[PDB]
Amino acid sequence: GLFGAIAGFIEGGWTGMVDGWYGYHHQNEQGSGYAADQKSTQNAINGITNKVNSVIEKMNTQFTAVGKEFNKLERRMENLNKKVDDGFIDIWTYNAELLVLLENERTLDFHDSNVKNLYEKVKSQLKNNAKEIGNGCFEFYHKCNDECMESVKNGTYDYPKYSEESKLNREKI
Amino acid sequence: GLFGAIAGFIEGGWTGMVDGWYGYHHQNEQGSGYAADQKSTQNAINGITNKVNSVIEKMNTQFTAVGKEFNKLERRMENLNKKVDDGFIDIWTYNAELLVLLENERTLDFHDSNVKNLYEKVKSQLKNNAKEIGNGCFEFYHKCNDECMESVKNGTYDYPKYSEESKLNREKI
Amino acid sequence: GLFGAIAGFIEGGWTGMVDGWYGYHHQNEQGSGYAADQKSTQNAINGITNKVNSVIEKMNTQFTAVGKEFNKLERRMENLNKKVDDGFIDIWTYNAELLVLLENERTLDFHDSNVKNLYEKVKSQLKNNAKEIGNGCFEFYHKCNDECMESVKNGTYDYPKYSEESKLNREKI
Amino acid sequence: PMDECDAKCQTPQGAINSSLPFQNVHPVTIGECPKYVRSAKLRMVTGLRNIPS
Amino acid sequence: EDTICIGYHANNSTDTVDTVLEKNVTVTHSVNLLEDSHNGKLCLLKGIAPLQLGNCSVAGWILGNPECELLISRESWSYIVEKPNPENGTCYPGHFADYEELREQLSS
Ligand SMILES: *[C@@H]1O[C@H](CO)[C@@H](O[C@@H]2O[C@H](CO)[C@@H](O[C@@H]3O[C@H](CO)[C@@H](O)[C@H](O)[C@@H]3O)[C@H](O)[C@H]2NC(C)=O)[C@H](O)[C@H]1NC(C)=O
Numbered sequence: 001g002l003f004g005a006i007a008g009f010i011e012g013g014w015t016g017m018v019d020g021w022y023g024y025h026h027q028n029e030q031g032s033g034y035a036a037d038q039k040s041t042q043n044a045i046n047g048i049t050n051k052v053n054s055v056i057e058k059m060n061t062q063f064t065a066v067g068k069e070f071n072k073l074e075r076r077m078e079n080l081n082k083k084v085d086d087g088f089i090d091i092w093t094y095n096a097e098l099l100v101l102l103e104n105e106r107t108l109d110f111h112d113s114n115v116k117n118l119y120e121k122v123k124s125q126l127k128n129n130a131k132e133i134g135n136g137c138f139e140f141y142h143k144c145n146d147e148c149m150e151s152v153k154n155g156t157y158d159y160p161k162y163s164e165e166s167k168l169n170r171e172k173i
Numbered sequence: 174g175l176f177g178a179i180a181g182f183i184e185g186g187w188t189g190m191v192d193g194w195y196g197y198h199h200q201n202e203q204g205s206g207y208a209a210d211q212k213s214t215q216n217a218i219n220g221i222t223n224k225v226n227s228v229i230e231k232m233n234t235q236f237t238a239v240g241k242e243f244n245k246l247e248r249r250m251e252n253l254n255k256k257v258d259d260g261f262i263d264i265w266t267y268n269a270e271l272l273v274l275l276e277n278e279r280t281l282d283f284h285d286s287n288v289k290n291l292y293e294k295v296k297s298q299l300k301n302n303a304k305e306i307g308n309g310c311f312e313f314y315h316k317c318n319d320e321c322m323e324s325v326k327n328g329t330y331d332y333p334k335y336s337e338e339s340k341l342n343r344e345k346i
Numbered sequence: 347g348l349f350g351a352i353a354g355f356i357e358g359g360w361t362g363m364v365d366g367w368y369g370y371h372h373q374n375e376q377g378s379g380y381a382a383d384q385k386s387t388q389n390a391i392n393g394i395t396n397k398v399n400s401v402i403e404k405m406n407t408q409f410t411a412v413g414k415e416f417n418k419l420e421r422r423m424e425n426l427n428k429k430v431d432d433g434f435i436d437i438w439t440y441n442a443e444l445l446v447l448l449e450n451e452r453t454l455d456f457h458d459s460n461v462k463n464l465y466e467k468v469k470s471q472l473k474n475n476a477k478e479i480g481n482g483c484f485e486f487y488h489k490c491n492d493e494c495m496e497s498v499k500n501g502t503y504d505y506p507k508y509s510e511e512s513k514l515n516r517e518k519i
Numbered sequence: 520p521m522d523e524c525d526a527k528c529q530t531p532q533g534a535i536n537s538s539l540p541f542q543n544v545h546p547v548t549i550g551e552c553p554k555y556v557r558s559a560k561l562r563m564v565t566g567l568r569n570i571p572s
Numbered sequence: 573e574d575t576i577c578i579g580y581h582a583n584n585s586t587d588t589v590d591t592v593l594e595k596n597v598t599v600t601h602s603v604n605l606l607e608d609s610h611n612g613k614l615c616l617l618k619g620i621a622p623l624q625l626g627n628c629s630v631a632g633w634i635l636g637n638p639e640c641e642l643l644i645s646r647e648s649w650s651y652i653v654e655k656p657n658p659e660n661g662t663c664y665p666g667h668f669a670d671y672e673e674l675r676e677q678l679s680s
């Protein structure tokens with residue numbers, strides 16, 4: 001919840017669904033259930049794919065032989081080559097470790113952005129037709145079937161469908 | 174559209190305008206047209222200026238001579254100096270390449286933020302006076318001249334100007 | 347104000363309060379005053395703590411001896427060891443300097459996110475009960491005591507408390 | 520000069536506080552030492568921007 | 573009538589940084605990463621003293637130049653101190669081979 005959801009307006013996670021990292025929880029007369037958002041989920045995971053390929057590939061590992069050895073009349077080259085190699089090991093160590101911390105932080109922010117984006121997409125259809133509730137959810141002033149669920153998933157609502165039912169069931173409140 | 178606009182709620186780009194990277198498209202009785210937002214556009218481009226100066230300048234290129242050469246009784250120093258220089262080349266290569274990827278990603282996010290910011294600025298004046306429509310745009314419940322356009326560009330509306338016209342032309346809807 | 351507040355919709359800073367980096371300014375009949383948001387403030391500052399510990403610690407400083415010296419029959423090793431060490435100094439210099447610029451930029455964005463998050467939290471309770479005003483603030487269509495202030499700080503309002511007072515004092519406007 | 524004072528890192532220009540990660544001061548050191556750069560300054564932000572009006 | 577506002581901190585501070593998108597960027601609070609300063613002394617490690625040659629070259633040190641204090645008491649130490657241009661090279665000259673290697677061997 002850097003941008004305000006997860007440990008934000010949302011508190012905790014849900015183990016009920018495992019098909020994909022995002023989704024909805026539908027609630028209606030036919031019942032309850034969880035259902036995953038494969039569209040943006042798979043888009044994101046492809047992002048992670050192109051990331052980690054663009055992490056691992058950036059190395060080039062030679063056909064290498066690391067080590068050397070010297071007498072005690074070559075201490076310059078010894079203590080040097082120590083200083084050399086320890087220099088590099090510390091550098092790669094430092095940079096790589098920073099890269100792990102940063103890229104995991106940016107990964108969380110990537111997720112945070114995606115969920116928040118999607119929340120606004122959910123919001124975009126149902127602005128006056130249905131209300132914010134609590135956190136994470138919207139209550140309808142009308143009724144919604146699984147057709148309405150699946151339609152609302154892929155970015156389809158038909159705004160005038162239940163516009164009047166919302167226009168009346170609001171008005172008691 | 175990391176933060177939700179470009180490939181987000183906005184789909185695609187516009188070739189009609191070339192003066193600056195951002196702007197508006199005005200639509201009114203006098204006609205249509207595009208008009209660039211030099212304020213935030215130039216601010217951003219100055220950001221890119223200070224960036225790239227703060228990229229290139231961070232190198233210091235010595236008056237350098239790269240190369241060496243040895244006999245075959247100096248293979249230690251040879252294979253060393255190979256390992257040395259290849260070490261560095263791979264390091265600079267790695268870091269710089271990561272920096273290109275990251276800074277272009279952060280560049281897109283910089284743009285995304287600027288446009289989204291501006292969208293909220295547009296929204297901030299006209300909250301009840303005029304409505305969200307579709308994506309990217311707002312329809313007015315009143316009429317707007319080029320004076321109204323240019324005023325709304327620089328952060329001026331006079332909220333009570335068409336407050337009542339919106340207060341009535343809403344009410345049919 | 348990358349995400350839209352500080353030099354964004356907010357213009358400038360406030361010296362009146364020094365207890366913590368964030369807070370509110372309460373205004374009511376009993377009077378005015380500033381009051382700091384220790385919750386998110388301290389959370390953030392703990393973030394800075396874990397950051398800077400995760401900056402300094404990533405170095406490992408050996409029990410080191412830097413320097414060497416040679417004759418003029420060892421110019422290879424001389425100009426080498428110059429090229430070596432200057433190589434490293436420039437590398438550490440470059441990477442570290444970039445890290446300062448980036449991490450301060452990301453620090454500003456961290457702050458920007460936190461304040462914007464909090465602004466939405468303030469907004470989340472009082473959506474129809476009270477209105478946006480100007481920038482940075484909300485005017486109430488009802489009256490709020492210090493109990494109401496402190497409650498609204500920790501994420502408590504009781505929405506139906508002044509729902510009707512807002513429902514009437516709106517309606518003149 | 521030379522003095523009875525104690526330290527953890529040292530260089531010809533002086534004895535050195537080994538607390539901080541970096542110097543820009545002088546490359547040569549002995550001990551548990553900061554690391555040299557060619558720079559003027561390096562200052563992270565703790566706080567944030569300052570504007571009265 | 574009543575109002576709620578956001579709030580945050582400013583101060584009298586004029587401490588600055590440089591940044592990707594702006595320079596001399598003033599903030600309220602800052603922290604200097606850097607140790608730009610030196611005490612201008614030759615302190616000692618840990619309570620362990622360093623060795624001192626004063627004017628002497630290492631040849632005048634190791635060999636037993638009487639003008640160089642032998643200082644057999646100095647059994648081990650923190651680091652070696654010289655000047656750049658040591659006065660007392662060898663009173664009877666003679667080429668000294670592997671000075672570099674020896675000094676490396678007597679690094680510590
Ligand atoms: C230790 O170092 C000191 C300082 O360098 C040496 O003393 C200096 O030695 C030079 C040698 O050329 C002296 O100059 C010579 O003086 C004699 C007269 O004494 C003259 O015949 C030569 O033509 C030349 O001018 C210099 O005066 C002398 N200075 C002092 C203050 O002693 C010293 O010899 C070194 N000792 C050892 C054991 O290495």
Ligand SMILES: *[C@@H]1O[C@H](CO)[C@@H](O[C@@H]2O[C@H](CO)[C@@H](O)[C@H](O)[C@H]2NC(C)=O)[C@H](O)[C@H]1NC(C)=O
Binds near residue numbers: 626627628659
């Ligand atoms: C190091 O060299 C300096 C040379 O500058 C020596 O200085 C001399 O000190 C004596 C008294 O001890 C004076 O009488 C001389 O006039 C000084 N000479 C000069 C040129 O200043 C110093 O004594 C030497 N110290 C050691 C430990 O060898």
Ligand SMILES: *[C@@H]1O[C@H](CO)[C@@H](O)[C@H](O)[C@H]1NC(C)=O
Binds near residue numbers: 146148150152154
């Ligand atoms: C969206 O879902 C509805 C039913 O929920 C379906 O009729 C329609 O074809 C779907 N559209 C797309 C683009 O998948």
Ligand SMILES: *[C@@H]1O[C@H](CO)[C@@H](O)[C@H](O)[C@H]1NC(C)=O
Binds near residue numbers: 319321324327329
């Ligand atoms: C903003 O635009 C209006 C007309 O559209 C103009 O009268 C006013 O001077 C402008 N203000 C600024 C600060 O540019």
Ligand SMILES: *[C@@H]1O[C@H](CO)[C@@H](O)[C@H](O)[C@H]1NC(C)=O
Binds near residue numbers: 493497498
């Ligand atoms: C929140 O504030 C109210 C009064 O403003 C207080 O009664 C309540 O205990 C507080 N809750 C928490 C969790 O601090």
Ligand SMILES: *[C@@H]1O[C@H](CO)[C@@H](O)[C@H](O)[C@H]1NC(C)=O
Binds near residue numbers: 536538539
């Ligand atoms: C060494 O540096 C630390 C941190 O900068 C400081 O707390 C301490 O007082 C310094 N000590 C000396 C002797 O400079």
Ligand SMILES: *[C@@H]1O[C@H](CO)[C@@H](O)[C@H](O)[C@H]1NC(C)=O
Binds near residue numbers: 584585
């Ligand atoms: C700013 O305030 C701090 C704390 O009161 C003080 O140490 C500093 O001297 C002040 N600077 C000026 C210029 O007033």
Ligand SMILES: *[C@@H]1O[C@H](CO)[C@@H](O)[C@H](O)[C@H]1NC(C)=O
Binds near residue numbers: 595596
């Ligand atoms: C910061 O840099 C800008 C560059 O134009 C300049 O206007 C301003 O005076 C500078 N401030 C200081 C304190 O150097």
